[PDB]
C-alpha cells in the first residue's frame, strides 16, 4: 500500500515544484500582455487557482453539518499565507512596495478588520453575503487599476492543473507514509493541514520569489486571504452558520497589520519574514492546532 503512497508523494512533489512555475511563469506572461501590475495577476487570478480548492472543500464541508471546518481551517489558510508562505518569500526576495499598492494593502486591511468584527455572531448565510459582494467589488476595484498570448494561457492552465493535482497526490502520498511509519494521528494530519492547504499558495509564492517577482507574492498572499474569506468561507457560511473563532481571528488581525506596516510606511524582505515566522511559530505553539 505505502508503495502507492510513496508514488503519489514524488510524482506529486514534481508537478509541485513545475506547476509552481509554469503557473507563475504563464501568469506573468499574462500579465505582460495585459498590462496588469505582476502583482494585480497574483492578487487575482492566482489567487483564486491557488485557493480554489480551500473553496470546494469549504463548500462541501460545512453542508456536511459539520461546518467547524469551513472557518478555522481557511483562517490558517490565510495565516500561514502570512506568517509562513509571505514570512519566508520575504526572506528569500525583498518587495518593492510603490504608492500604486500600499492604498491596497491597506484596503485589504479593511476587508479583514470588517469581516473579523461581524465574526463574533458567527456567520450567518448573511454575514456572508456581504463577503461574496465585497470580494467581487475588491476585484473589479483591484482589477481596474493595474495569438501570442496563446501559449501563456496553457503555461498557466496547464501549470495550475499540475499544482491543485500534486498536492493532492503529495499529500495523498505523504499521509499513507506518515501512517506506515506508524505515528498517526487526527491532529498531526491537522496541525499538517490548517497548515496544510494552501500548500499550493505556498509553493506559487515561493516559486514565484525565487524569481524575485514580490509583487506577485505579495498579490497571491493579499488575495488568497482574501479568497479565503470573501470567497471560500462565506461559501460555507451559506449552507449553515459557522460558529465563532475569534481568537484565530483576533491573531489573522495582528498579522495582517504587521503586513501592512511594512507597505506604505517601510519595505518588506529579509529581517521582517523572520518576525513573521517567529509569530507564525509561536502562533501554532498554542493556537487550535
Same mark, same amino acid.
Given at each position: 500500500m505505502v508503495?502507492?503512497?510513496?508514488?503519489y508523494?514524488?510524482?506529486?512533489?514534481?508537478?509541485?515544484?513545475?506547476?509552481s512555475?509554469?503557473?507563475?511563469?504563464?501568469?506573468?506572461?499574462?500579465?505582460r500582455h495585459?498590462?496588469?501590475s505582476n502583482?494585480?495577476?497574483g492578487?487575482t487570478?492566482?489567487?483564486?487557482?491557488?485557493?480554489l480548492p480551500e473553496?470546494?472543500?469549504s463548500?462541501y464541508a460545512?453542508?456536511?453539518?459539520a461546518p467547524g471546518i469551513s472557518?478555522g481551517?481557511?483562517i490558517?489558510?490565510?495565516?500561514?499565507n502570512?506568517g509562513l508562505v509571505?514570512?519566508?518569500?520575504?526572506?528569500?526576495s525583498?518587495?518593492?512596495v510603490?504608492?500604486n499598492?500600499?492604498k491596497?494593502?491597506?484596503?485589504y $486591511?479593511?476587508? %479583514?478588520?470588517?469581516? #473579523?468584527?461581524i465574526g463574533? *455572531? &458567527?456567520f450567518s448565510w /448573511?454575514d456572508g453575503v456581504?463577503?461574496?459582494?465585497?470580494?467581487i467589488?475588491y476585484?473589479?476595484w483591484?482589477?481596474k487599476?493595474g495569438p501570442?498570448?496563446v501559449?501563456?494561457?496553457?503555461?498557466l492552465?496547464?501549470? $495550475?492543473?499540475? %499544482?491543485?493535482v500534486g #498536492?493532492?497526490?503529495?499529500v *495523498? &502520498?505523504?499521509?499513507? /507514509?506518515?501512517?506506515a511509519?506508524?505515528?498517526?494521528?487526527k491532529?498531526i494530519?491537522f496541525?499538517?493541514?490548517?497548515f496544510?492547504?494552501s500548500l499550493?499558495e505556498?509553493?506559487?509564492?515561493?516559486?514565484?520569489?525565487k524569481r524575485?517577482?514580490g509583487?506577485?507574492?505579495?498579490?497571491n498572499?493579499?488575495g488568497?486571504n482574501?479568497a479565503?474569506?470573501?470567497?471560500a468561507?462565506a461559501?460555507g457560511?451559506?449552507f449553515?452558520?459557522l460558529p465563532?473563532e475569534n481568537?484565530?481571528?483576533?491573531?489573522?488581525?495582528?498579522?495582517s497589520l504587521?503586513l501592512?506596516?511594512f507597505?506604505?510606511?517601510?519595505?518588506?524582505g529579509?529581517w521582517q519574514g523572520?518576525?513573521?515566522?517567529?509569530?507564525?511559530?509561536?502562533?501554532?505553539?498554542?493556537l487550535?492546532?
Amino acid at each position: 500500500m505505502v508503495i502507492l503512497g510513496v508514488g503519489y508523494f514524488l510524482l506529486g512533489l514534481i508537478l509541485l515544484y513545475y506547476g509552481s512555475d509554469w503557473f507563475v511563469l504563464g501568469s506573468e506572461r499574462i500579465a505582460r500582455h495585459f498590462n496588469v501590475s505582476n502583482f494585480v495577476i497574483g492578487a487575482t487570478v492566482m489567487a483564486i487557482g491557488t485557493s480554489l480548492p480551500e473553496i470546494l472543500t469549504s463548500a462541501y464541508a460545512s453542508y456536511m453539518h459539520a461546518p467547524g471546518i469551513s472557518i478555522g481551517n481557511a483562517i490558517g489558510s490565510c495565516i500561514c499565507n502570512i506568517g509562513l508562505v509571505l514570512g519566508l518569500s520575504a526572506i528569500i526576495s525583498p518587495i518593492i512596495v510603490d504608492k500604486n499598492l500600499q492604498k491596497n494593502i491597506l484596503v485589504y $486591511l479593511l476587508f %479583514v478588520i470588517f469581516a #473579523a468584527v461581524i465574526g463574533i *455572531d &458567527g456567520f450567518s448565510w /448573511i454575514d456572508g453575503v456581504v463577503l461574496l459582494i465585497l470580494f467581487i467589488i475588491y476585484l473589479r476595484w483591484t482589477v481596474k487599476n493595474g495569438p501570442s498570448v496563446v501559449f501563456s494561457l496553457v503555461l498557466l492552465i496547464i501549470g $495550475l492543473i499540475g %499544482v491543485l493535482v500534486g #498536492a493532492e497526490l503529495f499529500v *495523498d &502520498g505523504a499521509k499513507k /507514509i506518515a501512517l506506515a511509519l506508524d505515528i498517526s494521528d487526527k491532529v498531526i494530519g491537522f496541525t499538517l493541514v490548517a497548515f496544510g492547504t494552501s500548500l499550493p499558495e505556498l509553493m506559487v509564492s515561493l516559486a514565484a520569489a525565487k524569481r524575485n517577482l514580490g509583487g506577485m507574492v505579495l498579490g497571491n498572499v493579499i488575495g488568497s486571504n482574501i479568497a479565503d474569506i470573501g470567497g471560500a468561507l462565506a461559501v460555507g457560511s451559506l449552507f449553515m452558520h459557522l460558529p465563532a473563532e475569534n481568537v484565530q481571528m483576533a491573531v489573522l488581525v495582528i498579522m495582517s497589520l504587521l503586513l501592512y506596516l511594512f507597505a506604505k510606511y517601510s519595505k518588506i524582505g529579509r529581517w521582517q519574514g523572520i518576525l513573521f515566522l517567529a509569530l507564525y511559530i509561536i502562533a501554532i505553539a498554542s493556537l487550535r492546532m
